[PDB]
Design a binder for this molecule. Sequence first.
Ligand SMILES: O=C(O)c1nc2ccccc2c2[nH]c3c(I)cccc3c12
Length: 347
Amino acid sequence: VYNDGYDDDNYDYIVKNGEKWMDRYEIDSLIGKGSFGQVVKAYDRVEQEWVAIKIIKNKKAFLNQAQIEVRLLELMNKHDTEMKYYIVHLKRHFMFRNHLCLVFEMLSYNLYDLLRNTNFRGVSLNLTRKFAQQMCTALLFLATPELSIIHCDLKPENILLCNPKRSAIKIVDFGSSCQLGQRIYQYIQSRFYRSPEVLLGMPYDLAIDMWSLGCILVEMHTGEPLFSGANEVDQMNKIVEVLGIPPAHILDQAPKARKFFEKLPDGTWNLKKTKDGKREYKPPGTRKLHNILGVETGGPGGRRAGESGHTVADYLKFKDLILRMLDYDPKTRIQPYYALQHSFFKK
Ligand SMILES: O=C(O)c1nc2ccccc2c2[nH]c3c(I)cccc3c12
């Protein structure tokens, strides 16, 4: 007996297709689940349109976090009433059978579905550019002083197409977002997309979303995650394979530095000592992004050899942008405004 029979044993509402709510919403089916709860497809009788309804778990901690989501969505939606800045539209919310429900505009496939449809061969560099420009514009929007919003969980699954045959996108899931003042969490971001500062337990700001974006864009074009760690130690090591040891000025201020690294008497840092002649990672900085992207070898896995819009010059620009997004130092990591001016975006 959970919530008088309406809930399962993980605080979720037991969805029933064909159910009608408040003489208004006709529940078609379940679209998906997340840590927050569920999302369903529904027809709104009153407005004569399909909508997506996020059903938050019936548990205080989740309800309370979703209240923050609502505040942030409404705040974004009123600075962006023209819907031109790439953020999902929250139409309204309501409580129902002890669940907070958020009603959103209907959207199409997310970018992971999109990758999956190519069998993980990746999408064209032209399409990757289109997503990147939109995403940087969205981050510019979030960075406006009145908002100062950190999404905190960018990943391909949270970027959706508006229409299945078009390149327009919206960002969803501000369920762990916060504003630059009011930061309340420590372990955040999905692991593959998690920034060094968060891994290191350091204070974080809007620049963590740019880190994530850097990872996403590479994955969109290569078809696989750039840094696919199975836990925090693995994750940090995979980053180090590509970018080398993080600078001393950061590790010196990092509460969790010694979870991954050790400081030599001479004042420099290294990876923690490994056992016994075991070898698991490439040496620091030797896994070059140059090769991962196949800059001079026909793109990822050679698969773009002799296609248009995949020149060496194109790839070099793309690579420069990504490396600026993956700067270890959040003070110098490229910011949305300057990213939008990068040569990768030239008309
Ligand atoms: O955070 C969300 O709002 C969200 N989370 C999801 C989580 C898992 C699977 C699907 C999800 C999902 N589909 C959506 C559609 I279609 C339109 C608007 C929002 C969403 C959404």
